[PDB]
Design a protein around this motif. Sequence first.
Motif, mmCIF file in Angstrom:
data_model
loop_
_atom_site.group_PDB
_atom_site.id
_atom_site.type_symbol
_atom_site.label_atom_id
_atom_site.label_comp_id
_atom_site.label_asym_id
_atom_site.label_seq_id
_atom_site.Cartn_x
_atom_site.Cartn_y
_atom_site.Cartn_z
ATOM 1 N N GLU A 1 0.779 -1.238 0.000
ATOM 2 C CA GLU A 1 0.000 0.000 0.000
ATOM 3 C C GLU A 1 0.815 1.295 0.000
ATOM 4 O O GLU A 1 0.241 2.383 0.053
ATOM 5 C CB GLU A 1 -1.015 -0.048 1.141
ATOM 6 C CG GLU A 1 -0.490 -0.150 2.573
ATOM 7 C CD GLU A 1 -1.607 -0.538 3.555
ATOM 8 O OE1 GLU A 1 -2.800 -0.614 3.188
ATOM 9 O OE2 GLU A 1 -1.301 -0.796 4.741
ATOM 10 N N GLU B 1 -4.365 5.875 -2.881
ATOM 11 C CA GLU B 1 -4.466 5.246 -1.576
ATOM 12 C C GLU B 1 -5.086 3.860 -1.753
ATOM 13 O O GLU B 1 -6.148 3.712 -2.355
ATOM 14 C CB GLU B 1 -5.372 6.115 -0.684
ATOM 15 C CG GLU B 1 -4.553 7.031 0.232
ATOM 16 C CD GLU B 1 -4.099 6.292 1.498
ATOM 17 O OE1 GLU B 1 -3.622 5.137 1.398
ATOM 18 O OE2 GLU B 1 -4.295 6.823 2.613
ATOM 19 N N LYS B 2 -4.419 2.819 -1.274
ATOM 20 C CA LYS B 2 -4.878 1.437 -1.353
ATOM 21 C C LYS B 2 -5.849 1.243 -0.189
ATOM 22 O O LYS B 2 -5.439 1.302 0.971
ATOM 23 C CB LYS B 2 -3.629 0.557 -1.294
ATOM 24 C CG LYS B 2 -3.772 -0.935 -1.602
ATOM 25 C CD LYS B 2 -4.646 -1.755 -0.653
ATOM 26 C CE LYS B 2 -4.037 -1.663 0.744
ATOM 27 N NZ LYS B 2 -4.767 -2.325 1.829
ATOM 28 N N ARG B 3 -7.134 1.049 -0.475
ATOM 29 C CA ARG B 3 -8.190 0.866 0.524
ATOM 30 C C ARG B 3 -8.955 -0.440 0.299
ATOM 31 O O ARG B 3 -8.655 -1.213 -0.609
ATOM 32 C CB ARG B 3 -9.117 2.103 0.526
ATOM 33 C CG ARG B 3 -8.373 3.430 0.777
ATOM 34 C CD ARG B 3 -9.232 4.439 1.558
ATOM 35 N NE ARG B 3 -8.566 5.744 1.716
ATOM 36 C CZ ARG B 3 -7.504 6.011 2.491
ATOM 37 N NH1 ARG B 3 -6.924 5.077 3.236
ATOM 38 N NH2 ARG B 3 -6.989 7.231 2.506
ATOM 39 N N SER C 1 -13.009 -2.013 0.047
ATOM 40 C CA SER C 1 -14.413 -1.776 -0.217
ATOM 41 C C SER C 1 -15.237 -2.284 0.947
ATOM 42 O O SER C 1 -15.272 -3.485 1.215
ATOM 43 C CB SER C 1 -14.830 -2.424 -1.543
ATOM 44 O OG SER C 1 -15.954 -1.748 -2.078
ATOM 45 N N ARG C 2 -15.919 -1.353 1.612
ATOM 46 C CA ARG C 2 -16.786 -1.587 2.762
ATOM 47 C C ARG C 2 -17.956 -2.533 2.472
ATOM 48 O O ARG C 2 -18.707 -2.845 3.395
ATOM 49 C CB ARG C 2 -17.278 -0.223 3.292
ATOM 50 C CG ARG C 2 -16.173 0.584 4.000
ATOM 51 C CD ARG C 2 -15.858 0.025 5.394
ATOM 52 N NE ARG C 2 -16.950 0.280 6.335
ATOM 53 C CZ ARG C 2 -17.068 -0.253 7.551
ATOM 54 N NH1 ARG C 2 -16.105 -1.000 8.076
ATOM 55 N NH2 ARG C 2 -18.176 -0.031 8.240
ATOM 56 N N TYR D 1 -7.690 0.274 -5.068
ATOM 57 C CA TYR D 1 -6.939 1.522 -5.022
ATOM 58 C C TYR D 1 -7.895 2.683 -5.286
ATOM 59 O O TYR D 1 -8.782 2.561 -6.130
ATOM 60 C CB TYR D 1 -5.833 1.479 -6.078
ATOM 61 C CG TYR D 1 -4.997 0.213 -6.068
ATOM 62 C CD1 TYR D 1 -4.164 -0.062 -4.972
ATOM 63 C CD2 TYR D 1 -5.002 -0.657 -7.172
ATOM 64 C CE1 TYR D 1 -3.291 -1.162 -4.991
ATOM 65 C CE2 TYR D 1 -4.164 -1.784 -7.179
ATOM 66 C CZ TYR D 1 -3.287 -2.029 -6.101
ATOM 67 O OH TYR D 1 -2.399 -3.057 -6.157
ATOM 68 N N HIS E 1 -7.878 10.027 -4.494
ATOM 69 C CA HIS E 1 -8.673 11.103 -3.913
ATOM 70 C C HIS E 1 -8.325 12.476 -4.507
ATOM 71 O O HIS E 1 -8.963 13.472 -4.165
ATOM 72 C CB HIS E 1 -8.531 11.071 -2.391
ATOM 73 C CG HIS E 1 -7.116 11.094 -1.895
ATOM 74 N ND1 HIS E 1 -6.429 12.214 -1.494
ATOM 75 C CD2 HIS E 1 -6.289 10.011 -1.754
ATOM 76 C CE1 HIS E 1 -5.204 11.816 -1.137
ATOM 77 N NE2 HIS E 1 -5.079 10.482 -1.243
ATOM 78 N N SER F 1 -10.825 5.373 -8.861
ATOM 79 C CA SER F 1 -10.573 4.196 -8.052
ATOM 80 C C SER F 1 -10.853 2.905 -8.809
ATOM 81 O O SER F 1 -11.872 2.803 -9.498
ATOM 82 C CB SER F 1 -11.423 4.264 -6.789
ATOM 83 O OG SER F 1 -12.813 4.386 -7.031
#
Length: 43
Positions: A8, A16-18, A20-21, A28, A31, A36
Amino acid sequence: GLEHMADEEKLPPGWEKRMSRSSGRVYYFNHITNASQWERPSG
C-alpha cells in the motif's frame, strides 16, 4: 494490524490502497482526481 504483504506504499502520489466496505474487497482510490479501481495506477 499485522500485515506481511505491505504493498500500500508502492502506489503513486494521490492514490491510496483501501478496502471496499461492501464485503472487504481490496482496491486503489485516487482522492486527487476521484478515480478508483483494482487496476494498479502508473504515476
